[PDB]
Design a protein around this ligand. Structure first.
Ligand SMILES: [Mn+2]
Ligand SMILES: [Mn+2]
Ligand SMILES: [Mn+2]
Lengths: 295, 303, 301
């Protein structure tokens, strides 16, 4: 049922480094054709650092692990009209023969299915603000707690509740480590105000943790949090307030906040988002190559 | 081989024919005698009339049974609340003590999945309770469905519970939730919850195709289909909702907690509504049995 | 190998003799040197005296150890609180960095399950913290027990934590919870929690039959047995001190890694050693009943 691209299939069969990539960043992070440009630049960074990129999406009901140029452009061109597909939506998107842009929870599922150990993303979903009134908590976190894969993120955006997100990850048995810092990063910016529960200082360090996790057959995964580079590192609070006073909820809520943050920052937040996923791709690829060498 | 599968259920499973799992806590605990027995038998009949084989699940003298005889349904109904209300976490204890257990959604999920039944019909699923922010009272039904790949066919979640938070928790647990032929998530006794359904399916065949995909993908999380109570009962919803609110207030003012709480609320609502809520409960489980059996048959045809 | 199994534990596993897992955070962090070592030896002796083999679990120089020698116990105890408190999520990192780690319930569950040990004695399990409704601080011990089919033998949950919410969370995770010979769920240092136990078991054989059924059913969730501290082994004092310690931690914003050690230390200071003495008594009692459960289970099988 799942279609693995020729390049990814070759790599997996030969034990070469593969880096999984998600597609909601393509459909919902930015408009066409900038979304396509970024996805291709991310894939190029993966290839230029010795790994094979496996962008995951669902197209016409077919889960695809590894996308061709045609599939990337086709996905990107549909823009925000593509179904944002969490793990729980996969079966429905398949059954309806639809297109789906897979989130972290869905991409985890497919990456694990075929034995990809490293999954590069921008930021992971989290515990939402005021969750003690709503219980709005991303399935990304639950999925990572029972999928043994390493997610390479730039931390968690302050749109979400970062302290509670860290607590929920801990409850779900997810190892969380910041890269070359004692501070947990906050996606757009390096400062979250939260201490990192653990630290790793090199791609080789990361690969050794992953290797141990694999060998032990633990069922919980890992969140690496790579602070956005210092050269690429009010709007959130105002966007949040506006969000409440205009009662934006459900599926509209998260796209509204990110868009508002981008508008209020005049493109600065999106630019940072682009910079961080590229940085995650660099470090993630180095981790994957180091891991492949270990194995 | 701790579990006993009846000849009728084993015959169906071995031949890839449609089977619908049914729970037994609605019999011993969820409904009074003898409507509890009457309804259980009528549900099994509806399952058969639509081409599937009913598999009511319970534990009898420490033996997990998948497929029950009429005398066993009668025993569960007659012994009533003296039968252990058996959640998944109670199964081992009821087996060890050689007791009788009427299985809830979390326990019935476990046994149905164990023997390869894909469709499980119930009235409603447990949920996040009201004031869960102070209590953290959240049904194991939700956790169980998040890690058991089976389709539960319900009429949604009762307003006794916190429906918006229940929907959030299901999402966090990776459970696909879809309302049947509606954009509104149903609230058990009534179709009106005030909550948008996160997804929608419009036919038994639609449902079967989602289940089929879930199976082929080997996902470990399950599915909640939520079937709004038939329109013929819509006039009763405001009444049952009003009584629900009064019963909740009464439970609080009388400090009814623990194992007493849920039975108190169901009984009180039926008393306040003069039997209307039980009548609605009977109608919705019959409707769920109808649609659930059609889903199971469609799925069997797909495979 | 993935793990180093001690000669005594390996022999027991191969010959079907009852084995009781033990954790090491109680040694490195839960108790001071040398009371920690003294108690660990006494607990292991109690396990042996009732017909089982103790398997204290830790990570030493990056190697998971199942079963410890006298030398290794001395090592964990003397290095004390400088050893990494190692939850399940920390195992891979402690292994990768070749470090020493004292394993909590969530980590010890993982290693016990790996080698097929069914009974794991601890003092108390982590829980839902007070004010979790603001913090969402909920121990991974609970999540782990909900998806690891092992019987944890505890003395309940300390009132430093939110006992009612801990019981609710365990229920949500499908963990069977039973108090031993009581209708009241125990509160670690003291037998009185003010919470009714959701279920009750009255003998080690009762417990073993529940475990046996859980095993035969292939359920993926575990069991918490809660053994009330012996009536002869101050409860009134430790509860009063607990309330005071909680207030102090709040007024001083003690958070993160500092919080739980602060509360346990403060309660012991405020009670003049009474709570540590109770902690020693309850882990010995858990070892007694837990080993009897493990032997009864081995006999059943
Ligand atoms: Mn959400
Ligand atoms: Mn409950
Ligand atoms: Mn904690």
């Amino acid at each position: 049922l799942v279609k693995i691209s020729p390049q990814v299939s070759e790599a997996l069969s030969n034990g070469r480094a593969v880096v999984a990539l998600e597609s909601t960043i393509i459909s919902h992070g930015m408009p066409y054709p900038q979304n396509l440009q970024t996805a291709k630049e991310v894939e190029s960074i993966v290839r230029e650092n010795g790994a094979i990129p496996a962008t995951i999406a669902i197209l016409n009901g077919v889960p695809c692990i590894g996308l061709s140029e045609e599939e990337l452009e086709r996905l990107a061109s549909l823009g925000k009209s593509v179904q944002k597909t969490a793990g729980r939506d996969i079966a429905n998107v398949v059954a309806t023969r639809g297109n789906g842009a897979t989130t972290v929870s869905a991409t985890l599922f497919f990456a694990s299915m075929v034995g990809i150990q490293v999954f590069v993303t921008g930021g992971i979903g989290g515990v939402h603000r005021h969750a003690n009134h709503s219980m709005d908590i991303s399935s990304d976190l639950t999925a990572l707690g029972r999928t043994p894969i390493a997610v390479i993120s730039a931390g968690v955006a302050s749109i979400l509740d970062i302290p509670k997100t860290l607590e929920y990850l801990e409850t779900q048995e997810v190892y969380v480590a910041a890269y070359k810092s004692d501070e947990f990063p906050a996606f757009f910016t390096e400062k979250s105000g939260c201490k990192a529960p653990s630290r790793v200082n090199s791609p080789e360090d990361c690969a050794r943790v992953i290797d141990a996790n694999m060998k032990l057959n633990r069922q919980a995964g890992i969140l690496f949090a790579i602070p956005i580079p210092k050269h690429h590192s009010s709007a959130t609070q105002r966007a949040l307030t506006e969000a409440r006073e205009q009662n934006v909820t459900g599926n509209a809520e998260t796209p509204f906040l990110l868009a508002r943050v981008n508008e209020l920052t005049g493109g600065t937040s999106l630019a940072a988002n682009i910079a961080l996923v590229k940085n995650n791709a660099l470090i993630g690829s180095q981790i994957a190559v180091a891991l492949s060498q270990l194995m």
